Design a protein around this ligand. Structure first.
Ligand SMILES: CCCCC/C=C\C\C=C/C=C/C=C/C[C@@H](O)CCCC(=O)O
Ligand SMILES: [Pr+3]
Length: 232
């Protein structure tokens, strides 16, 4: 759609409006990086692996009643890509779409002497989020607080939201401060709501799916009619 004509509460500019430009903050060697089919599958795979483990009742975390298999969203991905071109993690830009009224977003910054391959950047972000299982409590799951803590849970808690139905990421790499740098941004179809459950508890995993998936046995299939625009 036309993002310059899709308003949002707060009336902030939309990340998607106008022509794509690289931010000055990107220095003078920025390059946007295409997440190819294998990159999108790896991302989907890791996010669905962990959703399946958690919904199972892993880490004493409660069992999940209706946690869905996630799909890639090209629209979210475009907005993510476009966001990385600003070379900055946090902005007040709007990023809503017609389908996903309040998309969550995660940003993974990298800084080092050398630039790792795209796959290595993704595994870094996967590793970072995975490492928060040492931080996420069932308390957090019953009643989302982001801080907390100690310590950080936002990344992992967003990957296991049962309101989330779709993800889309983008990547820009550049050079500044004598370091190779990268911003990896993932937009999600939904977001965790402060004070509300990350996902709804059950006795059996997926006991509330119309249809459980055949690969991620503890999750609802791709066609589960979850509303990503309602919170828990
Ligand atoms: C672009 C990356 C998006 C990051 C989203 C945030 C967190 C997802 C993080 C980790 C997923 C890890 C999967 C690990 C292996 C799999 O067997 C999961 C179970 C391992 C375990 O139970 O500790
Ligand atoms: Pr292509």
């Amino acid at each position: 759609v036309n993002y310059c004509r899709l308003p949002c509460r707060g009336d902030n500019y939309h990340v998607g409006c106008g022509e794509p430009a690289y931010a000055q903050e990107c220095g003078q060697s920025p390059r946007t990086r295409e997440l190819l089919k294998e990159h999108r599958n790896e991302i989907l795979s890791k996010i669905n692996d962990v959703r399946d483990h958690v919904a199972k009742g892993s880490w004493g975390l409660p069992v999940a009643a209706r946690m869905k298999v996630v799909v890639w969203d090209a629209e979210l991905a475009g907005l993510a890509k476009r966001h990385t071109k600003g070379c900055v993690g946090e902005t007040h830009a709007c990023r809503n779409t017609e389908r996903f009224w309040l998309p969550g977003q995660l940003n993974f910054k990298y800084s080092g002497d050398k630039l790792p391959r795209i796959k290595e950047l993704i595994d870094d972000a996967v590793k970072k989020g995975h490492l928060q299982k040492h931080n996420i409590t069932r308390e957090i799951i019953e009643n989302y607080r982001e801080n907390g803590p100690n310590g950080d849970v936002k990344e992992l808690a967003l990957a296991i939201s049962d309101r989330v139905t779709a993800v889309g990421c983008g990547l820009t790499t550049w050079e500044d401060g004598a370091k190779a740098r990268a911003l990896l941004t993932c937009n999600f179809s939904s977001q965790n709501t402060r004070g509300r459950p990350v996902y709804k508890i059950g006795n059996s995993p997926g006991e509330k799916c119309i249809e459980k998936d055949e690969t991620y046995k503890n999750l609802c299939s791709a066609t589960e009619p979850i509303d990503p625009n309602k919170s828990n």
